[PDB]
């Protein structure tokens, strides 16, 4: 725990990707249910979530050519969500809009580093590999199911003038009693419709997030339920099938409900290979980055790891000396961490360089090697 003087903005900039990139201020958004023909990247094996920052390093000449093509066009590519990762099956996915690129010369081979951001969910209609080797995808955009307030269907026309509202636990009971009055007309009570109210679910998630992220809910967290649900899903350390199940959800109410179910149920994080080897707990999770405790980063090899930052970890051997080369958190040296039983790569132990920093040491675990566990 302790306190922090690190400045949580540097992790989101991905300063390790060379100098200042060519940032773009535009944005392209397709229509709902509209079909598009989008190119897919071959080496990307991540399940992308809207709003999630995605850095990438591509050196293959085919990849660099496709990157140039996209830079000259609408700057949008498709990231597949693989259900079976080995056979290249894809039923769902998320698009990503490139917002920074950097091709580097005075370098061995021609390489390009790109910062993109997930945009819109989609269903995979057709996958066809071209003669080039790169594969295109005919794709249908999936819309956001924004359902209205459940009381609007049973609202009394006399009470229409009461539906606007000018120690925190009494204000929420006042809210529940005033907004869901007409619930007496149905077969269900007010507290039941309080479980399907996006604002109450958002407040409960804000409560569970003030444990990890010390930033206030004033400016950091969005106010829209869909943006809030996606931001929460971006930093939920779960395994791949759970992330796919969460991505299938259309109604943001159901998304927030499932996220609260996960946050209340799963408490321990174990090794995905061991299944019975506790690595850490939900308590030790803290946010070193603005986007949350768990964000996507890229290594020199070009692989993408979703690093979750925790204060303490258990049952981890440390391999090798610390190193500062290509460190995702400047001012910290990483050290490879393996499971104490199966020796699988769990993450890295980041120790501070300067002795006046805080925290002096923390852990960054990759999501793909973790497994949620309830007692």
């Amino acid at each position: 725990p302790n306190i922090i003087n690190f400045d949580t903005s540097l992790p989101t900039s991905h300063t390790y990707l060379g100098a200042d990139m060519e940032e773009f201020h535009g944005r392209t958004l397709h229509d709902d249910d509209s079909c598009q023909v989008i190119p897919v990247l071959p080496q990307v094996m991540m399940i992308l979530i809207p709003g999630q920052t995605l850095p990438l390093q591509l050196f293959h000449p085919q990849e660099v050519s496709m990157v140039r093509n996209l830079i000259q066009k609408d700057r949008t590519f498709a990231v597949l969500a693989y259900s079976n990762v080995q056979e290249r099956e894809a039923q769902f996915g998320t698009t990503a809009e490139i917002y920074a690129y950097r091709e580097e010369q005075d370098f061995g081979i021609e390489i390009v580093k790109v910062k993109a951001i997930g945009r819109q969910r989609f269903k995979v209609l057709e996958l066809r590999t071209q003669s080039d080797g790169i594969q295109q995808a005919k794709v249908q955009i999936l819309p956001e199911c924004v359902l209205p307030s459940t009381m609007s269907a049973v609202q009394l026309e006399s009470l229409n003038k009461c539906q606007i509202f000018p120690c925190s636990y009494k204000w929420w009971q006042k809210y529940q009693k005033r907004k869901f009055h007409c619930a007496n007309l149905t077969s269900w009570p007010r507290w039941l419709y309080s479980l399907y109210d996006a604002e109450t679910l958002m407040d409960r998630i804000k409560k569970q997030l003030r444990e990890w992220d010390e930033n206030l809910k004033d400016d950091s967290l969005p106010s829209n339920p869909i943006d809030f649900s996606y931001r929460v899903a971006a930093c939920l350390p779960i395994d791949d099938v759970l992330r796919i199940q969460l991505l299938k959800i259309g109604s943001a109410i159901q998304r927030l409900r499932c996220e609260l179910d996960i946050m209340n149920k799963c408490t321990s994080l174990c090794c995905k290979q061991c299944q019975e080897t506790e690595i850490t707990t939900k308590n030790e999770i803290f946010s070193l980055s603005l986007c949350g405790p768990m964000a996507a980063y890229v290594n020199p090899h070009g692989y993408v790891h979703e690093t979750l930052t925790v204060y303490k970890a258990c049952n981890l051997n440390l391999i090798g000396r610390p190193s500062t080369e290509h460190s995702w958190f400047p001012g910290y040296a990483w050290t490879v961490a393996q499971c104490k039983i199966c020796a699988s790569h769990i993450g890295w132990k980041f120790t501070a360089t300067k002795k006046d920093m805080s925290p002096q040491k923390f852990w960054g675990l990759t999501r793909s090697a973790l497994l949620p566990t309830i007692p």
Partner: protein, 808 residues
């Protein structure tokens, strides 16, 4: 693939609006009442009311106002529907043939726009210069009232104030001016804007923006010679008019928030006000300009949805929660200190929250026992056909569930009342209700809270009432534990036990725990005039539903469905479980098939395997929409009601073709009802060679009751063609398309009504004239029952419709 038939057995009796004007004649005084999808016109006489006309529109009346532009002889009626169908109608009478004509009609639904939280707000300028509509946030629609505007064309104006509470057209102005109340990060304010028809824009009002009460809600436009606006909230009734600023704060209104109002004197000297609990206050204005405001307590009426002053001191009170009232206002109070005397009472069945069917009097003659009303207007309603005889048993507390037990000749009814924190310590009621005036009342014994109580806040207390079937006395009133909410109720015999029991499911609800993690299942027996607790079982969640399942107890507990056996030691023993992705709110059964339903339309059909001793998933469907009630029609059909007053029917395929497609429930039936269905239940009200198979009644929020039954393919096709031919010949009130009315309409998508026959349209065939009958039957020959094509005359379809009317 659905082949269903829905009919209205009882029209909606709930009142959602009432006005007074001169609609039929310039000398007659007319009272217009809106019952959702019904319009009732009356003439005010010295005795009371004289029924002149009742019409049925193809839309839920959201706004209803009378007005008279300079040039006409009598008033016209502006009407808006929930689907944004606007129209202006006139009354026309020639001898005995009355027909409501359509002066102007049109759709005003925007292409883009988020519907506002305050809903549809429609106002009319006094001098009849324009109509202002407030539908979406930050957009004020204006419909000019010139003689050439028969399309009802309109234009939008931009609002810098996004969160508008209420708005009124002010009297006594050269230009049409609106005065509204809004909110911003600073607080709540009131402001005025002048609407320009030349520039189609806003101009600075006559008086600037003032800061007002934090809970300022209602706005009242005061007519001449006064002018200005009155702002009413929870603690203050203020008045603004240019330089005039007058604020009062009487403590008599602090107990309950005022909701509706009406004008008494045309010049604006006296006003009636109704609050939530049902009280009626009088707001007096003292005179060229205002001198002071005064608020007196007139007395206790029904929980008013709307109010209107007739004449000679007679006032009509339209109540959706309770019965409609006509009351008298005396000059001198009576003995208890109340200026109110009830003149007449009209029945109101809304809101129906549960019901059942019993063979009370005759055997075979079904009768419907329903829970209706809420708070002091709650009651039981016994309905039988003779239009429909309805007996009322008042309860003065809110009923929630009900079931019938034959061997005991009585009913079990879950009920809830409101109490307040005692000055010392404990609770005290507001009125003596059924649970506090029973011949015997008990409390249960605990078998298992920090930051206790507050300063006089409301709390709900739940009871189980055993009520005789002959006398309807509250025989017993068993009170449940503190902070315990009763949800389900079933009367059944279980296992090899000959005793019949009342089983209740309850949840331990706390403020801090949003999701209840604690609940009970209790089993009572009633005999010899006393209730004893036979069995108790603790569970780790809310018992949302319970069902009699072939002699066992099928109970839902949050995200779990469990089966209980009845042991020889009279206990509840778990046999098997099933852990779902959703929380099981709705539970139904037929044979071994089990239906599970979530609030967001998540449906799951399971099957009990008797040789395995476990549950198995048969099918499931996930489509997000707010539900309200579910029902199993037959082995393959499943009916349900969802958001925007819509019904739907899903189907499964037993044989089917592929392992993947066998686990899907197709969306085969869709229909727009106009009513929020709260309860489905099998039964029929007619004495038991019939085209229909099955019978499921359903109760609604606005007091409407309906019946659904399946059909055959040929009969469905014939009735659909009949519906088309009848739409092409019948003149609609307001000129609204029937298919547009019955179209499954949400704000996200709109599709036509498939797999459903609107029984009201098929019934209206008998009302029209014989030439129109010959019009409809002309060139029919859609009979596909024999195998070829059989013709159809007028008498054939007359007899067909008569037999279709002989099912309710």
């Amino acid at each position: 693939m659905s082949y269903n038939y829905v009919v209205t057995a009882q029209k909606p009796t709930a009142v959602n609006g009432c006005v007074t004007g001169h609609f039929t004649s310039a000398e007659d005084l007319n009272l217009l009442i809106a019952k959702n999808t019904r319009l009732e016109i009356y003439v005010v006489t010295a005795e009371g009311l004289r029924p002149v006309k009742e019409v049925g529109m193809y839309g839920k009346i959201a706004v209803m106002e009378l007005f008279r532009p300079k040039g006409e002889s009598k008033d016209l009626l502006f009407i808006l529907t929930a689907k944004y169908n606007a129209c202006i109608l006139e009354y026309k009478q020639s001898g005995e043939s009355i027909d409501i004509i359509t002066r102007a009609h049109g759709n005003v639904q925007d292409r883009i726009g988020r519907p506002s939280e305050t809903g549809i707000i429609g106002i009319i300028d006094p001098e009849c210069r324009m109509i202002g509509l407030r539908l979406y946030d930050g957009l004020f629609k204006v419909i000019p009232l010139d003689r050439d505007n028969k399309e009802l064309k309109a234009f939008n104006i931009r609002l810098e104030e996004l969160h508008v509470i209420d708005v009124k057209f002010l009297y006594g102005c050269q230009a049409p001016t609106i005065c509204f109340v809004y909110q911003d990060p600073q607080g709540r304010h009131v402001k005025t804007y002048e609407v320009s028809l030349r520039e189609k824009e806003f101009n600075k009002g006559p008086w600037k923006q003032e800061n007002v009460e934090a809970e300022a809600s209602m706005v009242i436009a005061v007519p001449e010679p006064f002018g200005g606006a009155i702002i009413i909230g929870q603690e203050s009734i203020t008045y603004h008019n240019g330089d005039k600023y007058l604020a009062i704060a009487p403590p008599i209104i602090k107990q309950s928030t005022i909701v509706c109002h009406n004008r008494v004197d045309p010049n604006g000297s006296r006003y009636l006000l109704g609050d939530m609990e049902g009280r009626l206050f009088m707001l007096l204005l003292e005179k060229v300009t205002l001198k002071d405001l005064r608020v007196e307590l007139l007395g206790e009426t029904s929980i008013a949805e709307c109010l209107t002053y007739l004449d000679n001191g007679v006032v009509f009170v339209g109540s959706r929660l309770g019965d409609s009232q006509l009351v008298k206002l005396n000059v001198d109070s009576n003995e208890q200190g109340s200026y109110v005397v009830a003149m007449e009472t009209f029945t109101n069945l809304g809101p129906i929250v549960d019901m059942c069917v019993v063979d009370l009097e005759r055997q075979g003659q079904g009768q419907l026992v329903t829970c209706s009303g809420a708070f002091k207007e709650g009651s039981l309603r016994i309905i039988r056909n003779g239009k429909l005889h309805i007996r009322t048993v008042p309860l003065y507390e809110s009923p929630r569930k009900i079931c019938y037990q034959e061997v005991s000749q009585c009913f079990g009814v879950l009920s809830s009342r409101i109490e307040v924190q005692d000055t010392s310590g404990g609770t005290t009621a507001l009125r003596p209700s059924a649970s506090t005036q029973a011949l015997s009342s008990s409390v249960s014994s605990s078998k298992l809270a920090p930051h206790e109580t507050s300063f006089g806040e409301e709390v709900e207390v739940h009871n189980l009432l055993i009520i005789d079937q002959h006398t309807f006395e509250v025989l017993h009133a068993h009170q449940f534990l503190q902070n315990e909410y009763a949800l389900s109720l079933v009367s059944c015999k279980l296992g090899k036990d000959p005793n019949t029991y009342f089983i209740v499911g309850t949840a331990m609800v706390y403020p801090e725990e949003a999701e209840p993690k604690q609940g009970r299942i209790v089993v009572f027996q009633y005999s010899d005039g006393k209730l004893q607790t036979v069995a108790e079982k603790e569970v780790k969640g809310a018992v949302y539903s319970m069902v009699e399942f072939n002699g066992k107890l099928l109970a839902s507990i949050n995200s779990t469905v469990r089966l209980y056996e009845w042991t020889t030691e009279k206990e509840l023993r778990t046999e098997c479980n099933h852990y779902n992705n959703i929380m099981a709110l709705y539970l139904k059964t037929k044979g071994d098939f089990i239906l599970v339903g979530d609030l967001m339309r998540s449906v799951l059909l399971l099957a009990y395997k008797p040789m395995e001793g476990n549950f198995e998933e048969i099918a499931r469907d996930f489509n997000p929409n707010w539900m309200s009630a579910v029902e199993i029609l037959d082995d393959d059909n499943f009916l349900g009601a969802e958001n925007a007053f819509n019904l739907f029917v899903c189907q499964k395929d037993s044989a089917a073709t592929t392992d993947e497609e066998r686990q899907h429930l197709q969306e085969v039936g869709l229909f727009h009802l106009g009513e929020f269905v709260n309860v489905f239940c099998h039964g029929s009200l007619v004495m038991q060679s019939t085209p229909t198979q099955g019978s499921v009644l359903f109760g609604t929020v606005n007091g409407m009751i309906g019946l659904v039954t399946s059909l055959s393919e040929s009969w469905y096709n014939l009735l659909l063609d009949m519906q088309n031919r009848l739409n092409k010949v019948i003149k609609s009130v307001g000129k609204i398309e029937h298919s547009f009315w019955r179209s499954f309409h949400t704000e996200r998508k709109t599709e036509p009504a498939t797999g459903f026959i609107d029984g009201d349209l098929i019934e209206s065939f008998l009302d029209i004239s014989r030439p129109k009958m010959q019009e409809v039957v002309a060139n029919l020959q859609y009979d596909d029952g024999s195998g070829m094509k059989r013709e159809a005359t007028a008498d054939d379809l007359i007899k067909v419709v008569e037999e279709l009317t002989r099912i309710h």
